[PDB]
Each structure stands twice: as structure tokens, then as C-alpha cells.
Design a protein. Sequence first.
Lengths: 728, 728
Amino acid sequence: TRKTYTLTDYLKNTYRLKLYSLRWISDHEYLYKQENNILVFNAEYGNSSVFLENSTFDEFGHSINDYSISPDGQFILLEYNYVKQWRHSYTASYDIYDLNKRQLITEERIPNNTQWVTWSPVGHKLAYVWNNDIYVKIEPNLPSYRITWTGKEDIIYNGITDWVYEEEVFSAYSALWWSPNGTFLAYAQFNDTEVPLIEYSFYSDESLQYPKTVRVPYPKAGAVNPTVKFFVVNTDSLSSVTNATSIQITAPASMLIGDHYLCDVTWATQERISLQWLRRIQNYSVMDICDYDESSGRWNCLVARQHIEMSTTGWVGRFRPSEPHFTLDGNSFYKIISNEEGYRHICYFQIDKKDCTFITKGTWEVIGIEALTSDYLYYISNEYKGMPGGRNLYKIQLSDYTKVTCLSCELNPERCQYYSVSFSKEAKYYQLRCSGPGLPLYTLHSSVNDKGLRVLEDNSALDKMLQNVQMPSKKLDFIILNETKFWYQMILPPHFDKSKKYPLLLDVYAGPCSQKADTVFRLNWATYLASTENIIVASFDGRGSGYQGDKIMHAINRRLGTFEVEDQIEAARQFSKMGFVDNKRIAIWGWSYGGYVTSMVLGSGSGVFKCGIAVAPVSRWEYYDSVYTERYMGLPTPEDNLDHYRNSTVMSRAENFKQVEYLLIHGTADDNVHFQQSAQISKALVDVGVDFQAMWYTDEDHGIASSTAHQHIYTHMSHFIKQCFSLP
Amino acid sequence: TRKTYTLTDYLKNTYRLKLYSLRWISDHEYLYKQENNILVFNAEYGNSSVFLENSTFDEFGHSINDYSISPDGQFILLEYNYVKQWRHSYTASYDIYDLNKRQLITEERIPNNTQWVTWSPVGHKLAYVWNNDIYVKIEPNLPSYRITWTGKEDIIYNGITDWVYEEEVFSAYSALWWSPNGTFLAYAQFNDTEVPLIEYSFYSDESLQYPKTVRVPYPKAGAVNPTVKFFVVNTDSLSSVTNATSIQITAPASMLIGDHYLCDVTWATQERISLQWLRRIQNYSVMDICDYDESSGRWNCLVARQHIEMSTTGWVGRFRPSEPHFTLDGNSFYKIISNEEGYRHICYFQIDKKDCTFITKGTWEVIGIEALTSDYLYYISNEYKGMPGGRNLYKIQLSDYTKVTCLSCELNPERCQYYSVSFSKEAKYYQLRCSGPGLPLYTLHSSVNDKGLRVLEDNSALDKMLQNVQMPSKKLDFIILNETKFWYQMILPPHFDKSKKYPLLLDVYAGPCSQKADTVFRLNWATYLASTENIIVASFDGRGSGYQGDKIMHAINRRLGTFEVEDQIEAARQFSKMGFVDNKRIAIWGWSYGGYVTSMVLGSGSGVFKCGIAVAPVSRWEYYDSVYTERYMGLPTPEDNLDHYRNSTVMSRAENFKQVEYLLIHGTADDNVHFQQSAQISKALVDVGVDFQAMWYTDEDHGIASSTAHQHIYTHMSHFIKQCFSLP
Ligand SMILES: *[C@@H]1O[C@H](CO)[C@@H](O[C@@H]2O[C@H](CO)[C@@H](O)[C@H](O)[C@H]2NC(C)=O)[C@H](O)[C@H]1NC(C)=O
Ligand SMILES: *[C@@H]1O[C@H](CO)[C@@H](O[C@@H]2O[C@H](CO)[C@@H](O)[C@H](O)[C@H]2NC(C)=O)[C@H](O)[C@H]1NC(C)=O
Ligand SMILES: *[C@@H]1O[C@H](CO)[C@@H](O[C@@H]2O[C@H](CO)[C@@H](O)[C@H](O)[C@H]2NC(C)=O)[C@H](O)[C@H]1NC(C)=O
Ligand SMILES: *[C@@H]1O[C@H](CO)[C@@H](O[C@@H]2O[C@H](CO)[C@@H](O)[C@H](O)[C@H]2NC(C)=O)[C@H](O)[C@H]1NC(C)=O
Ligand SMILES: *[C@@H]1O[C@H](CO)[C@@H](O[C@@H]2O[C@H](CO)[C@@H](O)[C@H](O)[C@H]2NC(C)=O)[C@H](O)[C@H]1NC(C)=O
Ligand SMILES: *[C@@H]1O[C@H](CO)[C@@H](O[C@@H]2O[C@H](CO)[C@@H](O)[C@H](O)[C@H]2NC(C)=O)[C@H](O)[C@H]1NC(C)=O
Ligand SMILES: *[C@@H]1O[C@H](CO)[C@@H](O[C@H]2O[C@H](CO)[C@@H](O)[C@H](O)[C@H]2NC(C)=O)[C@H](O)[C@H]1NC(C)=O
Ligand SMILES: *[C@@H]1O[C@H](CO)[C@@H](O[C@H]2O[C@H](CO)[C@@H](O)[C@H](O)[C@H]2NC(C)=O)[C@H](O)[C@H]1NC(C)=O
Ligand SMILES: *[C@H]1O[C@H](CO)[C@@H](O[C@@H]2O[C@H](CO)[C@@H](O)[C@H](O)[C@H]2NC(C)=O)[C@H](O)[C@H]1NC(C)=O
Ligand SMILES: CC(=O)N(C)[C@H]1CC[C@H]([C@H](C)[C@H](N)C(=O)N2CC[C@H](F)C2)CC1
Ligand SMILES: CC(=O)N(C)[C@H]1CC[C@H]([C@H](C)[C@H](N)C(=O)N2CC[C@H](F)C2)CC1
Ligand SMILES: *[C@@H]1O[C@H](CO)[C@@H](O)[C@H](O)[C@H]1NC(C)=O
Ligand SMILES: *[C@@H]1O[C@H](CO)[C@@H](O)[C@H](O)[C@H]1NC(C)=O
Ligand SMILES: *[C@@H]1O[C@H](CO)[C@@H](O)[C@H](O)[C@H]1NC(C)=O
Ligand SMILES: *[C@@H]1O[C@H](CO)[C@@H](O)[C@H](O)[C@H]1NC(C)=O
Ligand SMILES: *[C@@H]1O[C@H](CO)[C@@H](O)[C@H](O)[C@H]1NC(C)=O
Ligand SMILES: *[C@@H]1O[C@H](CO)[C@@H](O)[C@H](O)[C@H]1NC(C)=O
Ligand code: NA
């Protein structure tokens, strides 16, 4: 009897998934790490060479966290002393190694505790942020030019984002942008002077006598937001003037009337930058296209080049206005926007004409634009077979839009339905990444003829190991509700038998534009629960989910905590009605938004669920950040949406929790969804006499991803689920 | 057939113990609040009159928290707007009602947010502290005089104690001491300038968007302590034109040489005051006796009247040097101190004589001196029947120490073996409060011939109700360990059958000088556990416990977390060998110091315990305050006792928790044993892969006593214990 996929297998990673991570360094060569060695590969033939011997930095005296080769291949940036901050931010030390001289640079070194560093897009210029100020080095071993002097910890951020901009807007810590050839350096300046601070204790090692109080500028819903400013400095003039002038580009009058955000920066050409701004009421955004004026040394944005983007049904963009992709001459660009029918498609824009032309359409959506050449635009969409949970690479001819070729659909339709791509520098080659439903498969392709060059990694090793294991299966399908299709997936136990009644665990997330029903292959907790515990783990994408049009996505506009919560309940009913579900053993669990929804469901009084687990849940929207929360809920004021803000809290449902078994979990150092959110849930439950299970994780954040905590929480949750299901 | 004492009975207080709290106002009368009325009783005959009508303040407009009649009966202080702070501290608003003119005073009223107020011991003067400064009012309706001007929140405390002095030294918020007739007002001043602050979050009601951060000057082991100064002011010579003059009384040189504490202030006569100082290394204290000089107007403390008290085996006193009891003329005094055999007895001191004479002796201890006349000294001791857990009132003839008379021993030996007492002004009368082993019995007596005048409260109502309930019994006995006997108590289930096997819960505290095996009658969680769940709840007093001499109490000196932990395991080990104990079902639980011992036991590797519960435990001594920790552990430096500080932690024992079920509980707003302590325990368990149960209580402090949390914690713990024991 073959063994099953156990909890230990998941926690110890016995069945390891292989991947192929490469870095394009040109139009036909890429870097690949193999046995601490860094090899360079010729895309066209697959032949390689040792680029950087693994013994090159033995006597460095430091463990190297990561490396970065300058665009011209002349130097290598070595990162060490890595110290994580939020989701993207961290501090580190850096050394620069001269590849030619093969010596390590020891003069004018990058400062320790550098917040961010980046090579210019061409050559080997460096820009970095230290103590909240920007600096630039024209040559690795020469003195830096200070760009800003206003830098101030927790107050003024130059070239780097504050907490909310890092997390909700740019998904990056950096806030600087080199022009295409590196002449200009643009950046944003965030001012958090009046932004309230979230404060929580950090206990650290046992040896710390007094706990530390972490303090971070974090704007909760309706609170004072940070303000922002944008600038551009000409780095080519740095060695000619004592203090180079950072030219400011002010936001349009339509944004200056109130609170607003800088939400996108994209260079069009060497002398043209585009910026998108968004009103604090995220249903109106403006894109400025600015040109350098060589005579005044200033930047001007012609109103005839200004593009407006608004929404009547919801907010703008999936999570923010989409980025523009400019054609080489910078006179036109492509951008994904939802059409008249509410589906996101590629629109072609002339920079000085307000009406764009859609080049794609249909009841499906474009996920992202991946590359653009003078002849073709390549993109990923979920058009194939009408599966919103699938993803494929497409190629559309710019001189004839009726010519669209799917480059990935038919490569291996049974094993691969969820693709990702990585083009080389001039899109001459591309690596395809298949992530499901079968084992991931990585392949390399030639753009000139779209022919497959070779397989890079097929995961045969794992395929062999999984042969002796009773792996569960996955079912992706849909049910119809109100004449609308809604997708779901089920991780079914091995030897599944429709004639039996299985206990069911509803795995939920359900935030706006989410998708929990896809064709991706995963080895996770649900795998163990299905394979070893014979539990059916299901997920449903109802109202509010994404990639299926604005009619479904904007259904929860200004109404979080309603429809996406109800559809999840309805989904469980529908499932039990399928006849292979033990109606007496139905659980639900989720993390983050998933924990909120799980909590809301357990407190609805539906009677459908027996027990549930909420990890790091949101409990009341006024505790979450302004940018994310307000986008879907507007402002928490009586003149706007306060009533629904006060009506969608978990706490007000405390009483119904007497009907279920609940396990509440939260990391104490969660900087994202503050431990405060669970502290208020527990207090509310204690106040109405409700018993439940709880667990805090000392010094863990929203991810509770430290090696030990990760194993501990899933172990703890397994016991709770087995117990609720009366399983040995 | 009849009911049992259930968990709801404990939580809802179905069975209430009646009390009789009176207040002596003279040597002949006392106040007793009845029907919300204040009656004055004549001790000799028992007749009374109404002193103040419950309806008198019907239209007050504020909920009166408490009252306080001036010594001369002319005024009454009304307390309202009560807001709790720490264990004894709080702020409130006050109003004074003139009992003569039946009118509420409206001129020059005490400020709101007053920190402490107190009448002069005689007459009707007032002294209060507001905004950390001292004020005095000679008359209720007259403008107060400002005594101090250095008051500064969290920095300078005048007339009130800081966090550590409140909790660990004075067991009071007040730091004011009126001379016997009210002429002088002595006060202490605390400076916490360099005392680090403990910081933690307070979430408050759901409506508070941002968690609040509480900051409290709290010196942990080895940290910078607050400094103290002592002053005395003449309240008979205050001027409304000039600022009151305070005379300082510096501490002795043997104290000034290093860190020290003021630990006792006791007026001897109208013009003599005594003070005891303790060195930071708590085994050396000095009592100064100071006399007022009418010529200079200073206070002189003659070196010839200096008294030293030191210890070679541990610290001084039970929790600090004992208080002196001066004779009328103030030329001699009585003080409890451990004799050469290590037992605490009453010693007689001449103020200018170095040697004191013991007036009691034997293998038992005096608990406290209760009253003194020229002919007798009245005290409480555990001498009767050699039971260290019993308490009785005795009087000893000051002219012949061989004549000791027990006054409570024989009153009712079956029902009463534990007494406390309350004497009237000149000890003409005394109230006896019996609290075990039977129901509490309150009686009144006359001193002249020790007549038993009358029964004030015998709890016959409760006795009648308890008859319809299957109440558990209590066994008090001792086991031997190395020729030394150690006492324990067992709360046994109804109809105890020695031929059956009962699960056993070890209820432990075990801090230094503690006692958990006594004759006191109690209705608590254990009552329910034994009466309804048939669980034997036992407690044991081992090395480190009090009232049995220094040989036992000082056994854990400089070694907390060793013998007191081992002895609990030995006791349980011995209980398991008894025929009525199911050695497969033995648990342990404790709170505070008991949470620490319980945790140290569960992590001992003994194998004796199946499960255990720790509520707000200490996890490592460096996290607890200086005054209490150093008393028993010395300083946490390598030159002193750091090595033992480091291996007496719970954390270092994480690994051993694999074979037990552990439930860890703690309130997040605990200002005493910081949540930090449990946060480090959970992190250490997570780090070694040990699963356990946990529960935090939002905004609850060390007592977790708010009505809802109290019910919730005991409910939750009950489920845990019943599950550990396989109980329906
Ligand atoms: C991959 O192989 C190619 C061709 O085999 C290498 O190209 C070299 O091109 C130069 C041109 O000046 C010739 O002199 C060399 O003899 C060629 N090498 C070989 C093996 O033919 C290319 O350098 C190789 N790239 C890597 C990364 O190994
Ligand atoms: C960041 O924004 C704050 C406003 O919140 C600016 O501070 C003000 O600066 C002006 C001009 O010096 C002063 O008159 C005000 O008193 C300041 N207000 C506050 C609340 O401090 C600050 O100058 C901005 N910093 C930068 C670099 O732009
Ligand atoms: C470089 O130029 C900038 C901009 O002129 C200088 O920044 C100003 O510094 C002065 C005095 O230090 C302040 O009063 C202004 O508020 C600053 N303006 C800005 C935009 O920061 C900077 O100090 C100059 N550095 C040097 C070395 O001259
Ligand atoms: C990068 O682009 C910039 C901007 O076009 C170039 O700088 C200009 O160069 C022209 C000469 O071709 C001069 O007439 C302008 O005065 C320059 N403008 C500025 C703002 O510097 C730069 O030469 C380009 N770099 C490279 C390597 O081609
Ligand atoms: C409280 O005791 C003080 C001190 O013994 C009394 O004050 C003294 O009284 C005598 C007689 O009137 C004066 O000659 C002294 O000069 C006073 N000394 C001081 C320091 O004031 C006071 O009278 C007593 N108060 C009461 C109410 O008995
Ligand atoms: C009071 O207790 C302290 C602490 O034990 C004693 O001081 C010294 O402590 C160190 C540390 O163990 C020993 O090495 C010394 O032998 C102790 N004695 C001295 C004089 O330093 C101190 O002796 C105790 N005082 C009394 C009166 O017993
Ligand atoms: C208790 O009873 C006595 C009488 O036995 C009361 O009487 C004494 O005090 C009264 C006023 O306080 C006077 O009217 C009596 O003359 C006086 N008698 C004696 C013998 O002292 C006494 O007041 C009563 N006490 C209370 C508190 O009611
Ligand atoms: C309270 O204690 C502080 C700390 O010792 C006293 O001030 C002292 O410490 C300051 C900062 O540590 C120093 O800057 C001062 O020089 C030092 N002495 C003085 C007189 O400030 C402070 O005075 C004390 N306050 C009172 C009212 O006693
Ligand atoms: C302490 O606060 C109370 C309440 O504010 C003061 O009492 C009065 O309260 C009323 C409203 O309830 C106000 O209109 C008055 O201004 C307050 N003062 C008076 C004299 O009525 C109280 O006076 C305050 N105590 C002190 C010493 O100022
Ligand atoms: C895809 C994209 O471009 N962006 C910018 C995303 C915007 C939402 C981010 C989180 C999901 C969210 N910030 C969070 O942590 N929540 C926790 C509470 C609530 F569920 C949201 C992740 C990046
Ligand atoms: C009897 C007496 O005179 N005094 C001054 C006592 C000294 C200890 C005090 C607490 C018991 C202690 N402070 C505490 O809360 N701990 C928690 C950790 C440790 F168990 C002690 C109570 C008053
Ligand atoms: C590169 O270094 C790794 C780790 O030190 C080692 O396993 C490997 O043998 C080295 N490369 C080669 C080709 O041996
Ligand atoms: C970084 O820190 C190390 C360690 O203290 C120090 O030796 C080195 O000189 C520092 N480098 C820079 C650029 O400051
Ligand atoms: C933007 O959203 C606000 C809030 O609902 C609304 O009042 C306004 O009309 C919206 N503007 C557009 C163009 O939909
Ligand atoms: C005073 O009020 C209480 C209720 O607060 C009431 O029970 C009692 O009867 C009243 N006292 C008198 C003498 O009526
Ligand atoms: C009393 O002393 C304080 C403290 O400096 C001073 O501010 C106040 O003015 C003084 N008042 C008189 C009358 O001297
Ligand atoms: C006596 O018993 C104690 C515990 O009560 C034990 O620790 C000690 O080693 C034994 N022997 C002596 C000589 O004290
Ligand atoms: Na009697």
C-alpha cells in the first residue's frame, strides 16, 4: 500500500518542486545559478560557461545574500547583512567587485544600512538610498553625489516608499526611476509628518530585558495620509555643478484640490516621462505625459497629452490603474482598461488623443502585457477554453489585429494550462513557465519563429517520487447562480468515491479581484488533508472575485463583508447538495482576508459550518490601511460610508459564535493586519460568554513564515481540524 | 440526589459568605454600613443609632464609590468617579458634606483626578495629592496650602508611591504619614527619572482606531531604581503668604553609600518618628529614631538610638523589615524578628539600647502584633496545636512573660482555627473574625475580662443553604521529608471513598513565605472541581514556604526555581502512591508565582504530571521587578548571581514539554508580570516544536478579574482539565 502525502512531508519539504530561475543579461544570454556557481547560457544553443566560480568569495568573511551584475557586465553588486523589514523593504551592506580587474573595490564604499540600491539601466551608474536620502555614483570607486538633504527617519522618504506606498501602491521599497539610457533619475518624496503611528511590542530574544515598541507611520481608514512630490534630476550634470537641481513635476490641478496618490511612473523615451495620479477617492485617475524642455531645463506636461480614467461601477484598475507600454518613439502606448462591457482589454493610445482603440475583446480578460516589439505585442490572458482560472501567452500582430496567435495553449494542453513568461532584452527569446495543472515545466523559445528550443526543467525527479504516493486529485469546474457561472475547485482524496460522504473544508480568501479556483499545481496543507486525512478541500470564487469582468468584481463595491461572504456560504450548500459531503462535518478556514471572511461566516448563524479557523484576520475595516480599505469602502464618515463600515465588523456577530467551534490565530508583530484586530475579536467573544480556541505567535508578522512558527501553526491547525471532524 | 457545587455557582456567587466589616471611631463605638445606611454601635451593649441616612445623598448626581467620616465625626468625605490604576492606586473626585449644618461644602473643593486623600488622625484636617503634589486643608471649606511644587507625572512623586514602591514595599499608593495628633505631616518623595519604562499596548473599546501604548516606570532586576527622600512639615504653622517649609531627614550613612529603599515609617509620639531603611542588597536594614527640636525646628536622629537588623541566611523580615510598636511614652518598642533558632518572635527594644529581649519563643511564629496597652501585648500566632496553618489571638503579660493566654483557641475549636482581629482605639474592645475550617464567625469581646459579648454574624443563612448541597471536605495533614514535616491540604470530593482512584489536581503557588495549606474555609474553583467533577485538589507547602522558620523559608535564598519546584514534584509523587489517587491522572496549575512553578514542573521531565495550566507566570527572573526579585535572587551580574538567573528560566526547559499537555494563559495589559513573560515561553515552545494550548485576554491585567474575563478563563480552564482527565 503506497504511502500518502503526510503533514511531515509538507512541513519538511520531502517532495521538492524544482524550478528554473534565470536572469537575462542581454538579448541572447542569461545567468543561472548551479551549485553555488553562476553560469552564463547562450539562449540559441544551450551551451554555457562559468561566469562566476563558487569559490570566488570564500574568504569574503560574509555570507552573500544576493548579487547584481551591472548592465555592461563590468561590475557585480554583492549584497550581504540582509535584514528584512516589510514585504519588500530591507537593509543590507554592499560591496562592488570589478569583473575585469577581478578585485574587490575598497574605496568610497556603499554605506552599511543602505535601504535601496540599483544600477542604471545602461552602463554601471549607481543610485542608492541611505538614511532616507538619495545618492548617486557615476563610477563604483568614486565619491557619491548627494541628491537630497531632507531625509528623515519615519518622516521624509526620498527615493523609497513609506509603509502604505510600499505595500498597497508600488509593491516595492524603491521609489526612484532611471530614464532609459540613465541620463535622468526620477524619484518620489513621501512626507509622513502627520500620519498616525501603529505601535506594538516586539519581544526579540529572551536576553532583551525590556520589550521594544515598534512604531511605524501607518494611515488607517479615514486617517491623515502621507503627501507626495515627484522630481527629476539630470545625473549627467552631477560632475559639472556643485549641487544638481531636482526639477519638480507637480500633480495636475484636478488632483491638487484634494488628497491624492502618485500611483505609476513610467518613462516613454530618454526625454519623456509619464505619471499617473489617483484621487483619494480611487475612482478617478489622471496620466500626465511630460517632456524635457532643453532650453529651460524644465519638465512640461501638455494638457493635450493628459489622459483621464474613471469608473462608475467601482474603483480604477484591478488593484490600481494599469501601467502603460510605450512604442519605441514614445508617441503611442498600450494600456489594459475595462471596456464598455466591463472586461479588461488592451487599448491603443496616441499620446495626444483622448480616445483609444481596443485591440482585443470578448468575455474574458487580458492579465498583463509582457513585451512589445515594432511588430508584435505579447500578452497573457484567460481566453483559452473560457477558463478564467487558466493563463496563456498570446501574440498579436500590430499591423493586423485579426491576427492573434496563442503561443502556449497547445504546447501540452493536458499538463499545462497556467503560463508565465520571461522575455530576453529585445524579446528575441522567451522562457515559458508552466505551473499547472500538471507538474511545472520550464521551456525556452525562439521569438523569430516561435519554435521550442529545449526543455529547461521538467520535474521528472519529482514525478518519479510521487509515483509511490497516493496523491489527491484536483477538480476545476463551475456552478450556475442567477444565470452567472461561478468557478470552484476541489482537492479530492485518493480513490475518491462519489457514493461516500466526505468531510469538507472550505478554504477561503475571497478578497476583491481574488481567484482561489485555478489550474495551478500545488503541494500544500490541503494536499496532506486530502491525501492522508481523506478530507475534501474546496474553494469558491463568488461575487467580488476577479478576471471575469467588472460585473462580478465590482459587485462588492462599498459593500465588503456581504456578498463575498454570503456566496461562500451558498457555495457550501451547493457542495453538500452534490451528495458526497458529510453535511455534519463542514469546516471553513482562511488567512488574512480569508480569516475575516471565515470569521464573518462563522458568525452569520447559517448553521452550515461546524467549526473554522481564522488566521491574522481583519475584524473591522477602520483598523486597516487607508489606500486598500478606502478603494473598496470609500471614507468612514457619516457623509460617505460609515454605516457599512460599522455594519461589517466581526465583533458585532460575537453572539452567533456560540453555534460553532472557533480557532483564532495571530502573530503579535503583524505590521500589516495589526494583532489589534484579533485582540478586539477575542474581547468581543469574552464579553458575550463565548468559548473558543486561540493562539498567538510571538514576534511573527502577517506571514507567520519563520521556519519554526510555520511548522507549529499548521501542526496546531491539523489537530483542531482532526478533532472537529472526529478523526484519529 | 441533592445538587453539587457547580461551576455556575462559583461564577455567579450563588452561595455568598456574609461578613461584618466595622470601623472603630473610638474606644467604645464603631460604624457599620447596613441597608446602605451608616449606623454607630455601642460595643458594650450592642445598641445603635443611625449616623447617616442612605437617602441623604439621593440627589447627589454621582455614584458614590465610598465614604470616609472625619475622626471627629463632623464631616464625611464622599468618593466618586473612581478610576482604578494598579493594585492599590486610583484617582477619584471628592466632595465634603458638613454633618453639623447638614450641607455639602461648595467652596475650595478638592480637585478632580485626586490621587490620594486622608483625614488627620484626630480632628478634621485633610491632606491630599493632586498632580503628584501635596496639599493640606486645615478646614474643609478653606483654601488649601501647597506643600510641594516639584510634582511631575512619571518622574517626581510627592506623597504617593511609584509603581514598585506601591506594589512591593508599602502595599499602598499613599506615602503620607500624619503625626498622632495631626501637627506634623511626614511624606516621602520618589524620583524615577532614570527608571526604564515598561511599554505595552492597550486596545480599549472597539471604537479606538489606534491601539494606545501604556508606559510605566518599572525597574526590572538589576535596572536603575527610583531614589527616595523623606520630609516632615509642620501643618500648624502654614502661611497663605509664604511657601510651607519641609524639613528633610536624610538616611544613615550606611545607606547613602549605595542604592537603598525607605521601607517603614512609624510615628512613636507627637514629636518622635522612626524610619527603617533597607539596602538594595536586602539583608541589612537600619532603623532611625528621630526627635523634634523646638529650638532649631529640625529633626535629629541620635546614632545612639540607631538599630540594625541583618540576616546571614537570607533577606530581612518576611517581605521586608517588620513594623515597630511603640509604648505610650515612646521610649521602648516591640518588633517581630527572627530569633537565633530562625523563628519569628516578639523582641522588646529600649530606644537607646542595642540589645533587645525576646518575650516569646518556641517552634512556631508570631504573625503580627495586634494591640498594645501598658499591661498587655496582643498578638496572633500559629502556636496552637503546632499547626502552622492555624491562627489564634494571644495576649502576654508585659510584667511576666511566662503568662501567655490564648483568647481564641477554645472559643469553638471544631469550627474555628484561623482568626484575625480588630481592636478599638485603646484596645478596650476587640472583634474576632474566624474564617475556618467552618463558616466565618464574627464576634465582639471586651478586654478587661475577655468576655464574649455577642455574635455579630454567624453565617447561619449560608449554613442553611449549604445543607442542600453535596459539599467537599478538606483534609489538612503533613508528610515527612528528611526528618522535616511539610504540610498539605486536600479538597476531597463528596462521599470520599478511599477504595477508589480519583484524578488529582495540584493547586500550587509556592512563592517565598507562602502558605497554601491552611484551615481557611473557601468557596472557589477547587470547590467546584471536587464537588461536581470528583477531582481531588491538593496543595503543598515545601521549602521556601512561610510561618515555619528561616530554615524552611530561606532554603530557596538566591535559588528561586529549585527546591520549591522539586518539593511540589515530591509531594505529587507521594500523593500518587496513595491508594485513592489515579497516578495516570495528575495535573498541576498555578497563577503568578504559581504559574512559574507549574511551568518549571511541567518542564522538569519528572513524568508525574499529565497536564498543567499556567496563568500569568513569571518565565525568567530578569523580567520581574527589582525590589521583589533581588530580595530573593541578589543582582543579575556575573559577580553576584547571574548564573542562577540564567538557568532558572522556563524557556531553557522547553524541550521537556513534549510529554505533557500545557495551557498557557495571560492578560495583555498585565502591568505586574508583563505579557512579555508568556510571549517568551510560547516562542521557546514553538522553537523546539512543542504543541500546546494558549489564551490571551485582551486588556486584562494580572488579576484577569473583570466579570466577563473571570467567567471565561475559569470556563476555558475547566474544559481543559476535564478533557485531560477524560471527564464527561
Ligand atoms: C557557446 O558556444 C558558442 C559556439 O560554440 C561560443 O561562441 C564562440 O564564438 C567565438 C567568436 O569569436 C569563437 O572564437 C569561439 O570559438 C566560439 N566558441 C565555440 C565553443 O565554438 C560561445 O562563446 C559559447 N557561450 C558560452 C556562454 O559558453
Ligand atoms: C512635510 O510636511 C510637513 C507638514 O505636515 C511640513 O512641516 C511644516 O513645515 C512648515 C514650513 O517649515 C512649518 O511652518 C510647519 O510648522 C510644519 N508643519 C508641521 C506639522 O510640522 C514639512 O516641511 C514637510 N517636509 C518637507 C521636506 O516637505
Ligand atoms: C543643495 O540644493 C538644495 C536645494 O536648493 C539645498 O536644500 C535647501 O537647503 C536649505 C539650507 O540648507 C534649506 O533652507 C532649503 O529648505 C532646502 N531646500 C530643499 C529643496 O531641500 C541643499 O541644502 C543644497 N546642498 C548643498 C550642500 O548646498
Ligand atoms: C541619453 O539621452 C539624453 C537625452 O536625450 C542624451 O542627452 C542629450 O544629448 C544630446 C546630444 O545627442 C544633447 O544635445 C542634449 O543637450 C542632451 N540632453 C541632456 C538633457 O543631457 C544623452 O546623450 C543620451 N545618452 C546616450 C549614452 O546616448
Ligand atoms: C500636638 O503635639 C504638638 C507637639 O507636642 C503640640 O505642639 C506643641 O504645643 C506646645 C504647647 O502648646 C507648644 O508650646 C509647642 O511649641 C508646640 N510644638 C510644636 C512643634 O508645635 C500640639 O499642641 C499638639 N496638638 C494637639 C491638638 O494636641
Ligand atoms: C548579605 O548578602 C550578600 C549577598 O550574598 C553578602 O555579600 C557577599 O556576597 C558575595 C556573593 O555571594 C559573597 O562572595 C560574599 O562572601 C558576601 N559577603 C560579603 C561581605 O561580601 C553579605 O555578606 C550578606 N550580609 C550579611 C550580614 O549576611
Ligand atoms: C446606647 O445606649 C445608651 C444607653 O444605655 C445610650 O445612652 C448614653 O448616651 C445617650 C446619648 O448618646 C444619652 O442620652 C444617655 O444619657 C447615655 N447613657 C449612658 C448610661 O451613658 C447611648 O447613646 C447609645 N449609643 C448609641 C450609639 O445609640
Ligand atoms: C531627580 O533625579 C534626577 C536624576 O538624578 C536629578 O537630576 C540629575 O540628573 C540629571 C539627568 O540625569 C542631570 O542632568 C542633573 O545634573 C542631576 N542633578 C540635578 C540637580 O538635576 C533631579 O534633580 C532629581 N529631581 C529632584 C526634584 O530631586
Ligand atoms: C473637576 O471637574 C468637575 C466636573 O467638570 C468640576 O465640577 C463642575 O462641573 C460642571 C459640569 O458638571 C462645570 O460646568 C463646572 O465648570 C465645574 N466646576 C464647578 C465649580 O461647578 C469641578 O469643579 C472640578 N474640580 C475642580 C477643583 O476644579
Ligand atoms: C496585486 C497588486 O498589484 N497589489 C498592489 C496587491 C494589493 C493588495 C496587497 C495585499 C493583499 C493587502 N495589502 C493585504 O495584505 N491585506 C490584508 C487585509 C486585506 F485582505 C488586504 C498585495 C499586493
Ligand atoms: C505581604 C507583603 O507585605 N507584601 C509587601 C507582598 C509582596 C509580594 C506582592 C506580590 C505577591 C508580588 N508582587 C507579585 O505580584 N508577584 C508576581 C510575581 C511573583 F510571584 C510576585 C504582594 C504584597
Ligand atoms: C561549486 O561549489 C559547490 C558548493 O561549494 C560545490 O558543490 C560544487 O562542487 C562546485 N562546483 C563544481 C563544478 O564542482
Ligand atoms: C560597515 O561595517 C563594518 C563592521 O563594523 C565596518 O568594518 C566597515 O568599515 C563598514 N563599511 C562602511 C562602508 O561603513
Ligand atoms: C466617484 O466615487 C464617488 C463616491 O461614490 C461618487 O460620488 C462619484 O460620483 C464617483 N465618480 C465617478 C466618475 O464615478
Ligand atoms: C436605604 O436604601 C436601601 C436600598 O439602597 C434600602 O434597601 C433601605 O431600605 C433604605 N434604608 C432605609 C432605612 O429605608
Ligand atoms: C512658592 O514656590 C514656587 C516654586 O518655585 C514658586 O513658583 C512660587 O511662586 C512660590 N510662591 C511664593 C509665594 O513664594
Ligand atoms: C535532606 O533533605 C533535603 C530536602 O528536604 C535534601 O535536599 C538534602 O540533600 C537532604 N540531606 C541533607 C544533609 O540535608
Ligand atoms: Na455573650
